Amino acid sequence: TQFEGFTNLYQVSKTLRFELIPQGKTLKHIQEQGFIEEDKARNDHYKELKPIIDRIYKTYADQCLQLVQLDWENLSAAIDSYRKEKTEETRNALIEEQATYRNAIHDYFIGRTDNLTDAINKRHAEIYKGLFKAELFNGKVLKQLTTTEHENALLRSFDKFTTYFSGFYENRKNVFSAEDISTAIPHRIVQDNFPKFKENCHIFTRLITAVPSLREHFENVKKAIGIFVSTSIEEVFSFPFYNQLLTQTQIDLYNQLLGGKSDEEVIQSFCKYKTLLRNENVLETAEALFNELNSIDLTHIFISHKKLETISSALCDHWDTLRNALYERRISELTGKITKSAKEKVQRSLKHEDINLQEIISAAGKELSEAFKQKTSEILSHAHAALDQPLPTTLKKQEEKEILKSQLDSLLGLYHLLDWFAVDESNEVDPEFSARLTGIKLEMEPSLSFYNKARNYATKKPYSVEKFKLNFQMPTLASGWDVNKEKCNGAILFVKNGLYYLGIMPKALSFEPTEKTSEGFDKMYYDYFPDAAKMIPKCSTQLKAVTAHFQTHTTPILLSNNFIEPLEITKEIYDLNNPEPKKFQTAYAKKTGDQKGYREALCKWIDFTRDFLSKYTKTTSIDLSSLRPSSQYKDLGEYYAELNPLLYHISFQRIAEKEIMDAVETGKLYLFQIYNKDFAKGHHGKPNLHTLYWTGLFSPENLAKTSIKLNGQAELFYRPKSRMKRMAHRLGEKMLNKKLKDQKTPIPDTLYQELYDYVNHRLSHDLSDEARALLPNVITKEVSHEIIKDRRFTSDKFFFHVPITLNYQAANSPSKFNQRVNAYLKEHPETPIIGIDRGERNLIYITVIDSTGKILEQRSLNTIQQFDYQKKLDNREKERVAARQAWSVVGTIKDLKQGYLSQVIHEIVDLMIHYQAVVVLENLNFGFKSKRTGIAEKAVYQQFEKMLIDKLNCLVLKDYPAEKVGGVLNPYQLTDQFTSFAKMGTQSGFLFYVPAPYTSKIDPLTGFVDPFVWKTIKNHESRKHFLEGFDFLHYDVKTGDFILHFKMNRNLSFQRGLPGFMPAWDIVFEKNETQFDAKGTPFIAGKRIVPVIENHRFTGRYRDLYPANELIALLEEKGIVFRDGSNILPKLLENDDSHAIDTMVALIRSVLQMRNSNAATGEDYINSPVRDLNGVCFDSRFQNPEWPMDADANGAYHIALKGQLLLNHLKESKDLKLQNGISNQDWLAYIQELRN
RNA sequence: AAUUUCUACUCUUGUAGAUAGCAGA
DNA sequence: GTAGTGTTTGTCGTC
DNA sequence: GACGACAAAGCACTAC
């Protein structure tokens, strides 16, 4: 079992796309008969007919909901018990109780409820059966419930084309489904409206009991409107009335008892909604509500737990402070011996409960109220200052786009503020406050969709990719390529001079083949026979005439209808097909074994099949002699696995050029050249993968032995043109490049446009200082030939979609792919490992490690195909965001990252095959990535991992030959088929996923990590404790380095809870000597880039810091003797100076900071604070090639080491299974012990 | 700035990589 | 008239 | 225990 043998494991289906160029006079014939216009109306009716069809669903669903009568007492008790006890047993009890009620509603739809009689119950089943297929159009379902002529004309527009509603059928199943999905009617009744109605009944009785006069007052409101005349006010707040609140008309009446495409379109609609906010005075109402909070009872104003951490980060130092302050005050009011169990109960309570505003203020201090007041007025003033600010006239200028976004940010800011308060009725909400808040919260609700609509309008491309499929009045066009079904599908293919053509017969063309010597096209003859397990009984035994004759009368028969010679069927072989489980099937093997009867039945069936294939019309000559004798086959399985591949075949027969060309002239054939930019006249270079798929499908070897099957169900399309502002490079102008002379640094976007206007003599202004300096370095080109910016959408285009099945000879689905991969990895201990980590100074960095741990190659992936993506392109695009912060610039970056990740896919698969390695990514469930990194978190990288699995699902390298494995005919199968993001584990074929955290902040030489969390210590007293835990600090005179001994069994409150190996450490203040690297460049050893500037501004600017030089400067000023090598900590503690004790902790902060990054001066290195067994401190500035070169190298190096940990456990464990993740402590113990 | 179309691009009337379509979020 | 044009079934695999 | 995968067997109804 070699690595190179991971081919032909399971089938992979892909769909190709091509542009059909009308050849000859086929364009005139199409327009003359108007297929395109008729098809345009049909897609443009797919919108007129949809509301008409919905009348059937709406009426039938409404009618079924009118008879629903249920007892909701059980559902209420399950809701109460879950709110009472928050245990997993009461949750599962509620989930089952909800599923029971959803099915009770579902049984009204399908007709399986005991509440209705059989006559009514069965009538619904006859409707629900044909409710999601072509029976909607019969009028039959509407006959159970009258069409107009225009509606009838709209129904017939989809004659032989109702598959256009394929996805729509699924959307309507989501409406009537009984599953726990929010698109469904049962879910809306059971899990959405009833908890609201159940809460309404509780709010009602509490008010009536406290204020009984409110009862007659509520009754007067109901009588004064006229709703629910036959129902009193107490009954509408009782459970039985909810059965009459299941239809929209009743829901509307219930709610009324409670309540009583273009540029100017975004301006007219927003200003209309904007001017509506003034008339409702929602700002004045909101400003009055937040002003009430200064005097009203704050123990009944609740903050949502889903927003508490967000509020903490917006009003306090960190997200932690609020949850922690509430934790300390609640522990402060526990009873008796406060165990660690009681503390964990307080922790879990704070995760899922709403906190009242008073408990927050009493726990956080008066400085939260000032933060709450300041943030509230800040948001309210911005929304108030935006409602009176008028919108611009157009969105032509970016300055006019900015003010539209600025006002939407103020509107979304107020909308964000209102969602701070808990909405659920589980809390004791204020009467007036909850009503006034919910009113303005729902009146600010449309502002969220207005933010998203406007952004998509500005970030959309100037094209119009919308398109409608072409049917040519044939419902089953391109459904199948077979010659027998050629007539009824009207789709064929050709080939001539290496150019592939598609032929369509519009509303017989008896093509007469000619010899190969005659010039012309080569028609593809497609012969297919789906499966012998189903075709042969259908065509031989289960014929209607044959079955009826044998059931009644017992004599045999010679079948001479559609057969080259009569075939024969005896009485017994029909009984073998239909016994009194089938005998030739594995019936005896499953139960009641009989070997003698089995083989006789098996051999009779197989010999029948061979005779039938010889006598059937089109299978009479398809290589039937290659079958191996019948009597010794084990079962039908290995026969059909051998018979089905032979049935599929493709042949090419020459057809005269005159016949095809004249056929197009007379209008009986619609030629269409398949064109995908790889058949152009100027094409010189390696082609697209899909072209190789298409070229390899018709290669002589593929027809000889099938590996890529040409599936049916192909589709055609037509894309109307959409040109708004055609811009092109006409002759006589100058085409400026987007890269400099070195061909790797892109020009900034704003500067390139200015230079393009200047070099072309169109800029009326003067080049800026930076623009002028860039002029001598840019290259210009004359317009040799005319170029159109996005020529694709300038004119109408046809499109052809065709599916292919790669690895057709393999199984349908993979069978234990991970087990096979693990088995190979077990027997090949020398396999290398590939790790990928997103760096801060570069997008992607990769390191490959051998079996025993040494690095074979560390590379930066920010320069792909002679183009720098991170250092220049993403950085200047990032610079644009800081300058503008508009919507369009945000869209460009997201598109660019996806384009970058496409390039990275090629390098991973290329490097993998060269090393035959397993690539270890980082799983996204665990950890979080810093904002300074180029690639976003879990947004674009999560899609990138899926694209890697899909690429390796069927991997082809376009340089590899077709015959050799790794090519188009025999693609690699290196990963299992993708199922879901959540379903995938730590291993998917040759891809391993490891936890991201603790991979960069680690010394590669020692495995050391910063053992202290710096968030814990703020106070002077904690600084005394922190520096007391350390054993001793002394100045080694011989080496000139301070040594700080630390023991992991101390300062447990300041650690992070991850001891690891190495019970004792020696943190050293290495001397600031001018060391030299491999290249000879000088640097100062021990240099640290620390960002500590202010208490609130700890990141604004970076400063050079030298721990050795600042420590000796501090000790000298304090007059603390250190040349003798004596302990320094006892002297500092007994000296008792606040400044020295404070500064020393910051120095310990600095030394422990391995990550040193400075964007301006271009340093990114890791300097270790501890020495390894050799007695040398790691410093990546030395550029040692056997250790990580840069900081981003360390992250990729340790991610690959984490994958090595999983692979090592694979080898040591007897079973072929992997641990479901690895703990942080285990990883720390592994790396620290390994380096010892 | 020309692409089945997506990104980036222009010695090269195109280059390099990706690309499972269809309907609905 | 009469066949040329223009929905249903076969065991599977998959669940 | 119902849903795809395909053709080819199965019924209408009329152009010829």
Numbering used by the authors: 2 to 146, 150 to 264, 324 to 570, 577 to 649, 652 to 1307
Question: What do the authors say?
Answer:
CRISPR-Cas12a uses guide RNAs to identify complementary ∼20-nucleotide sequences in genomic DNA to facilitate binding and double-strand cleavage. To engage DNA, Cas12a probes nucleotides immediately adjacent to 5′-TTTV-3′ protospacer adjacent motifs (PAMs) to test for guide RNA hybridization (1–3). We used cryo-electron microscopy (cryo-EM) to determine structures of a complex between Acidaminococcus sp. Cas12a-guide RNA and a PAM-containing non target DNA molecule. Using site-specific cross-linking to trap the otherwise transient encounter between the Cas12a ribonucleoprotein (RNP) and the DNA, we observed three classes of DNA conformations with different degrees of bending relative to a standard B-form helix.
In all structures, the PAM sits in the Cas12a PAM-binding pocket. DNA in the candidate protospacer region is progressively bent and underwound from structures 1 to 3. In structure 1 and 3, key interactions between Lys548 and the PAM are absent. Gln656 interacts with the (+2) phosphate in structure 1, and with (+3) phosphate in structure 3 due to general PI domain shift towards the DNA and DNA bending, which brings (+3) phosphate closer to Gln656. We propose that structures 1 through 3 represent progression through a conformational landscape of protein movement and concomitant DNA bending.
